[PDB]
Design a protein around this ligand. Structure first.
Ligand SMILES: [Mg+2]
Ligand SMILES: [Mg+2]
Ligand SMILES: [Mg+2]
Ligand SMILES: [Mg+2]
Ligand SMILES: [Mg+2]
Ligand SMILES: [Mg+2]
Ligand SMILES: [Mg+2]
Ligand SMILES: [Mg+2]
Ligand SMILES: [Mg+2]
Ligand SMILES: [Mg+2]
Ligand SMILES: [Mg+2]
Ligand SMILES: [Mg+2]
Ligand SMILES: [Mg+2]
Ligand SMILES: [Mg+2]
Ligand SMILES: [Mg+2]
Ligand SMILES: [Mg+2]
Ligand SMILES: [Mg+2]
Ligand SMILES: [Mg+2]
Ligand SMILES: [Mg+2]
Lengths: 127, 188, 65, 36
RNA sequence: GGGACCGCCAGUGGCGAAGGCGCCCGGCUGGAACGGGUCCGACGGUGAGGGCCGAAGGCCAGGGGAGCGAACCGGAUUAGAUACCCGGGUAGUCCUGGCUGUAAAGGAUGCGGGCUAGGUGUCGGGCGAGCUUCGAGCUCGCCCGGUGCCGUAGGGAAGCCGUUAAGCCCGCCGCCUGGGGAGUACGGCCGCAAGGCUGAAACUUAAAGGAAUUGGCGGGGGAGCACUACAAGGGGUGGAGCGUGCGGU
RNA sequence: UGGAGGUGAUUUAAAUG
RNA sequence: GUCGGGCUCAUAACCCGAA
């Protein structure tokens, strides 16, 4: 038939993580981050690092029989920033280029209905 | 050796529950079939019944039994897509929510979230009256129907249509939906 | 190993710290995405009808004001 | 203490909050010695 | 398994004396507007003394502790860095019973009554008219009470205020009398404590303070320009000996 | 035409006369 | 640490060479 999986993309201002699981999520097919493809901390969240990691993960997934994925992309969320970093969309485009079919795309950033207090004080970072 | 470990795994076919058709919804890998129990899969209603309208309705199925290379599931809950309900809430409209705990005719415990969107801003007393209409309709439906019939009428849109027809007399409406369902308990 | 040629069809504007960079729209002439139009950043004088040799065709420059 | 909002202006003087803290520090020393 | 908090809708929107108050359902309870050929019959205003309420923080007893985080412990930055930045972290932040009575507690504008052009939004109640899917629905006009904006007479040093007055008039209470010394010293009352209320003198000084003007400047914004600016380049000076000018001796 | 509010952000170091 | 030169309107910081 068609073996379909899920691509979980975690994108912040400091790094990017691309993690492919099966359709239920309980089994890990492949997992690559920005620090595994570059040597400098400054380049970890760049679009090019996201492309490289997505390509490695997609190749490992294709060798094992995955044909397509559905995509779940998230920023850190909670009491941290709600906006994804610059690597998410580059990672999305690279998966399709490497040979995977793409299903539905959704954002799953966790959002509180008035949760906890964030760091920094009532004055924030002072730079 | 890592590749060898991946070669021990067999693939199992997952089926939808009996009253949804029992069709094939996917495949999942595992070495021991005991580890397949209690896994959950999310599928849209458009996948089961083919129609390009109900693509935002998401159903969750949980594996409860494995026989051979087949895995069978039960209904666990339902939710509308985040981007869909985000497109409904606007400024200069009113959003009315109601969260109710119910028991079905055959002893199932459920929690049900309903939502109504009014055309313009309305007074607090009118919101309360609409919420009360929602509560009465849902309690009556729970009294009448079994688990399977209630779930089907909730996901098709029948209960919402009854709610909108009843709530027209308080204020004209823009939308009416069963926002979410979760199953809490099952009969002994 | 030998790059892919692309033809400049439109000039967008100048950029860079000292104004030394120009952004253009190019059409790929060879390879997998032959026919695709993408925008790129270039160092040096350039006009409509020039040909660049891109070493890869998956990076696209950010649109400038 | 009584309020003198003119003292809060900054032209040609140090911040009143810290002047107040210094005055209170001085008053504690006098009260301790008055007990002996 | 746990403790705190209720997103979007949300509106110079609503309620309250002020401080303050936002998930849903049920019970108890305070105040106001509108409608009123209902009742009482000046029963009113202000208020020295006196009384009650009063953010955050702090204190005294007993609980609780997710997240955050004075003090403190480490990593950096720097000439130094007792900080700003990063990794941890006690009190506290939460609940029950008390004490403390303080804020740029600011509408920096005490409260009651009469009068003095308009225009235009919005919230609650009432009236009239027209629509209507017959809805506790929609549109327009008018009265009363709240809540914004523009503005006439008048006011003001001006900024501006202008029927929600900082305008003209009838009341009562509180406060001020150049800048500092000083909200200090001494005396008293209150508080477990920290602290609160009350409050001078010797001496010093020509301004201090307010609103607005023209410039100059900004590690503020926008537009424009130069090989004594850069970018892309070509040739060099700075090291040696010597010509010549300057400092010093 | 001109105004009043709210939420986000702000790429090293740089004392003195 | 000493001496000399850079950078600055100038001083401190900072950079270079030397004994
Ligand atoms: Mg790393
Ligand atoms: Mg700094
Ligand atoms: Mg004054
Ligand atoms: Mg009194
Ligand atoms: Mg810290
Ligand atoms: Mg911490
Ligand atoms: Mg206040
Ligand atoms: Mg104010
Ligand atoms: Mg005052
Ligand atoms: Mg009205
Ligand atoms: Mg009011
Ligand atoms: Mg009015
Ligand atoms: Mg005016
Ligand atoms: Mg005086
Ligand atoms: Mg005393
Ligand atoms: Mg020069
Ligand atoms: Mg140059
Ligand atoms: Mg020379
Ligand atoms: Mg120097």
């Amino acid at each position: 038939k068609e073996k379909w999986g899920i691509a979980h993309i975690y994108s912040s201002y400091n790094n990017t993580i691309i993690h492919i699981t099966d359709i239920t999520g309980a089994e890990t097919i492949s997992r690559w981050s920005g620090g595994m493809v570059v040597k400098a901390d400054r380049d970890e969240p760049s679009p090019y690092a996201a492309m490289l990691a997505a390509r490695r993960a997609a190749e490992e997934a294709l060798e094992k029989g995955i044909v397509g994925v559905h995509i779940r992309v998230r920023a850190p969320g909670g009491s941290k920033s709600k906006t994804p970093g610059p690597g998410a969309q580059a990672a999305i485009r690279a998966l399709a280029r490497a040979g995977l079919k793409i299903g539905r795309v959704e954002d799953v950033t966790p959002i509180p209905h008035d949760g906890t207090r964030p760091k920094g004080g009532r004055r924030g970072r002072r730079v | 050796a890592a590749k060898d470990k991946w070669k021990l795994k067999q693939w199992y076919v997952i089926y939808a529950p009996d009253f949804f058709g029992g069709v094939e919804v996917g495949l999942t890998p595992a070495d021991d079939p005991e580890k397949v129990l209690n896994r959950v899969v999310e599928v849209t209603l458009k996948d089961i019944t083919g129609d390009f309208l109900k693509g935002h309705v998401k159903l969750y199925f949980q594996v409860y039994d494995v026989k051979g290379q087949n895995a069978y599931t039960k209904f666990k809950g339902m939710k509308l897509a985040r981007s869909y309900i985000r497109s409904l809430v606007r400024r200069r409209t009113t959003r009315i929510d109601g969260i109710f705990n119910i028991t079905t005719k055959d002893g199932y415990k459920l929690r049900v979230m309903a939502m109504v969107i009014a055309a313009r801003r309305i007074q607090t007393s009118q919101e309360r009256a609409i919420r009360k209409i929602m509560q009465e309709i849902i309690y009556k439906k729970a009294e009448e129907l079994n688990f399977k019939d209630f779930v089907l009428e909730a996901v098709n849109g029948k209960i919402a249509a009854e709610i909108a027809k009843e709530a027209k007399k308080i204020y004209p409406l823009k939308k009416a939906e069963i926002r979410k369902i979760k199953v809490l308990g099952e009969p002994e | 190993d030998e790059g892919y040629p692309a033809e400049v069809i439109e000039i967008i504007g100048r950029t860079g710290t000292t104004g030394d960079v120009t952004q253009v729209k190019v059409r790929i002439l060879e390879g997998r995405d032959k026919g695709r139009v993408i925008r790129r950043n270039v160092r040096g004088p350039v006009r409509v009808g020039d040909i660049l040799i891109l070493r890869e065709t998956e990076r696209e420059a950010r649109e400038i004001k | 203490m009584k309020r003198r909002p003119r003292k809060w202006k900054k032209k040609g003087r140090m911040r009143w909050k810290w002047i107040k803290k210094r005055i209170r520090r001085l008053k504690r020393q006098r009260k301790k010695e008055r007990g002996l």
